[PDB]
Amino acid sequence: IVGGYTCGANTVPYQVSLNSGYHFCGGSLINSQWVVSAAHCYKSGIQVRLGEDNINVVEGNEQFISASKSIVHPSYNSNTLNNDIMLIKLKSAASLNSRVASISLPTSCASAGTQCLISGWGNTKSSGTSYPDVLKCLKAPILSDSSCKSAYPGQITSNMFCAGYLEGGKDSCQGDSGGPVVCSGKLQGIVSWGSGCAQKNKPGVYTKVCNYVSWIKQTIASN
Template sequence: MEQLTWSAVLLLLALSVRETFTQRIIGGQEVERYSIKYQASIQYNRNHYCGATLIRPQWVVSAAHCWRPAQLIQVVLSEHSLVEEEGFEQVFNISKIFVHYSYNYKTFNNDIMLIKLSEPAKLNAYVQPAPLPEDDTPALPGYTTCTVSGWGVTRIYSYFLSPVLRAVDVQTIPYCHHYYYWRITDNMMCAGSRFGGKDSCQGDSGGPLICNGNLEGIVSWGISCANPYFPGVYTQVRMYVRWIDWIINSDNPNN
């Protein structure tokens, strides 16, 4: 009963952030099994509550608001179904967690954290890291097509996670501050559909937004889901490439 209570609390915490801000896959479809090789699931007691992205064999990146004590969580790679064991999962305990030193839990600025796995992942046909963008390249142009993936809810106002990994194509939305005014910082980017109906949602938080083959965004926050007037807000990864490299190299120069 205690384990069930903890699972329910963690799921409700993960779900609550997006209605007053977090996310899920709306308007997408189930992906081909193991086709999104960098996708990770952060779990408590084998219950998914946030997404993450493998960027090095022993490192995943996620949203800082997905933080939980390291001893309580695990990271699962090569996961497709949350309800059945498929035999290809790689399950890891957590060695260390690095939340960005300037993360603001009220504004979601600098909503990024690095998780060091207990051991390196076995890279194979189902598990591969996602490339990071170059930090000195121009920002993505507006309306660039990107893909966001996760196990989040598939209907607005639902609290039931998708049992399988899903994805949807969205577009980067320029002039993000026109939608959210002062809430948007240079460390954030918006993506969605100009017509609504496509978005990430509760349970997708921390997961990847891939544009032109690179990890450009981390699912962070928003108002409602799939609303044309309020696109999803993502941590802009290119703003943190140097920080990511610094953390990894400082922790282990040979990693």
């Protein structure tokens, strides 16, 4: 996250860190046994870490659980990144508490203007590499599809939306991937892609989760 602030230990209790010997992507807990992340975060051998704040220190509120199965969206295109969402089932169900809680899926899609909270342990420098050990947060509004499509001509589909600042300075970045974009209490986006990070007129692009609620509900109930 570039231009964000330290969230505070466990203030985003539904944030997960996907680890395959190191942190490589973020994710969101949707219920005690399932996590939603981005399909471009697919790997084999993933351990889900809940209750994290500093990912380099065991501070006492973590739960490390391995995944039993991963389901990448049936129509995910790795070249355009369209339908960039994946579900992960935990081998055991998490124990939910104040520090580990699930986030709610949306009943409708959010409007341009809506302020959201985006979080992750991704790169914090636009020009450079600096990876934080504690969770970083960023409040950014959803942008109109028009400014999103002008920034990325012929690349934005109906399954994506942009959020951020066209002036640049604030954005999600690699390492935040798969992470949550919560607006009004509902998980509305998943960190998917962008042009570098925090560049002027290059906002972040997120997966539009309101378009996948039936696929999510049907998939977890049948797995």
